[PDB]
Amino acid sequence: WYLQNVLSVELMKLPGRTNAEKIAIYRGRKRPATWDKSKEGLMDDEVLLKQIVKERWRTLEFGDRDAGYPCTFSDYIQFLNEWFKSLDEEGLQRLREHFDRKIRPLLAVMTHVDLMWLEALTQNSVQNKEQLERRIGFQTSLGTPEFFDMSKRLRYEINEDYKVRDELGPELFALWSKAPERWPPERLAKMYGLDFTLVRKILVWHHFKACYDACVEPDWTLPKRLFALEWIRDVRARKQGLFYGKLRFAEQKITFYSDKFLFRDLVNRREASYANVWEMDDPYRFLQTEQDYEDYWGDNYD
Amino acid sequence: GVFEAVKALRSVSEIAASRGKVPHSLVYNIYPYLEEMRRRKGMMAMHPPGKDGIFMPNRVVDNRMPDHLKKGYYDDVYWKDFFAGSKEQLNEPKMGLRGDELRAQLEESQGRTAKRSNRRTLDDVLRRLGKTSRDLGALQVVNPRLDAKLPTHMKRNYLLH
Amino acid sequence: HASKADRLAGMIEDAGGFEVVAHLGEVDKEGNAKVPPLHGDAHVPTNVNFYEMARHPWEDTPSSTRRDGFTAGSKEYFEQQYKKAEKAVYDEAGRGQRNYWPSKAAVDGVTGEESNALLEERFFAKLRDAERGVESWARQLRKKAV
């Protein structure tokens, strides 16, 4: 079934494209004189392709071979039990990421209402699916039929300015991949106008996606050399406390620095001198004494 | 007592601004600022010379073209007949559309049926034939529910094409 | 001096310190200046164009506007299907003139070679010919499950 209805791309067939349908799109989106398309019609042929796979998935129901039931729950889970145990460790990465790309944001938003509805997926009647739906009939008459679905609960998020759907491909990757030292983060920090500790957060994922896109092994110690200042503190913050873990706001000190306390730190910076640029952006500028060097490098035993 | 013992409590942040002093935890947010001053040496701190950065209006400019030239204006660069039905880009919306699309507009606008005169419109005629609206294809009428001479239907829509 | 007043004492001290050059600024009585000086070689840089350094990756234009791309081929085939559909609606009798009022069967009729047959006859078949030779315990079993 999977090969017949999911991988057989030729077996997929899109709604017929008439001349009026064609000219519409070529004057609609390739030439989008009328810019936007925000509606629900049989057009754009791309959501439908993923939809056709999706709708084929929804129609699927685990059952006998005596009837039009395509596959048996035993045979189904057998296929997974067969293929899961055939998964390459890298395939686990794609799976583990898939479990979190889709399922985890669903199972987080779940209540008692959805319990009956979850079983309809695996077509696996467990305790009671007839009497319980009337309990859901109670909440659903007092609940919008659109929101109570599981598919729609995540339709909105924050910060549509930088989206994950576009930032997969690392920007400027052709340049900073050639000689990574030539590109300290302060060069690409401006490329992301988000909060700083956030911009240096996403910059890690940019490096890790960049490497995998080129199959090379990713620099596992970039974040530590990236969040150097962050790292050197906690290593100390750990070696003062009796707790093991990261530093939350609570255990941070309660000092009240004056309004002008870093002035000497400023006229230092506002009057710094650097012979070659790399000196200015060196990754070990943070490291002044041995007490620093011992901690920063205390990670890599090597 | 205890609830009052909590209502009395003032936060660390509340204490901080009160004493006019940045708290210790909230000073990492200044670190990126200090980074630019540190990395501003040389080129980055030298503005464009002679260039203000603010430019005033120096002409009264407008390229608003007539409608006729606007029709086939972009013949070569793009897909023929640019301003198909764009009310916002064209002054005349219905200009240039093909026979069905203009019909589609009045078919989606679609002022519902009412009692008619004995000069019953093609809408009455096309229904008694099962050819409701798209099926007068070669025919020049664009609004099927109108009682006028066929030239009057065509003469009104000769500009639109 | 409003800025570099202080650090200069330290700046010299670490940059290499005072190296003493005997007769550095001395002018010879004939007119020569002994100890030909260090010379300023700094020149306006000529090979720096970050725009040509990072281009629109496939169509290399030194730009910065992020405009998405339609994959080559899937744009051309897309266009080639439009003209073939364009050729149907607006110029039906081959007269070439734009017929603004098209025929119904011309409005809704599909493109001539829209439904790819070559891909069937030139590729799908050539696969099926080799498929005819697969083992008998397989060809049925293939047909069976599919």
């Binding site: 200042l229 050197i232 503190r233 906690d234 530093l247 230092n268 002044q288 | - | -």
Partner: peptide, 21 residues
């Protein structure tokens, strides 16, 4: 750094150690 003219980087300029992985 020995003369105090060098721009410092204390632990005090540390933000949160973010969960990347």
């Amino acid at each position: 750094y020995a003369r105090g003219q060098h721009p410092s980087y204390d632990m005090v300029y540390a933000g949160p150690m973010p969960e990347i992985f």
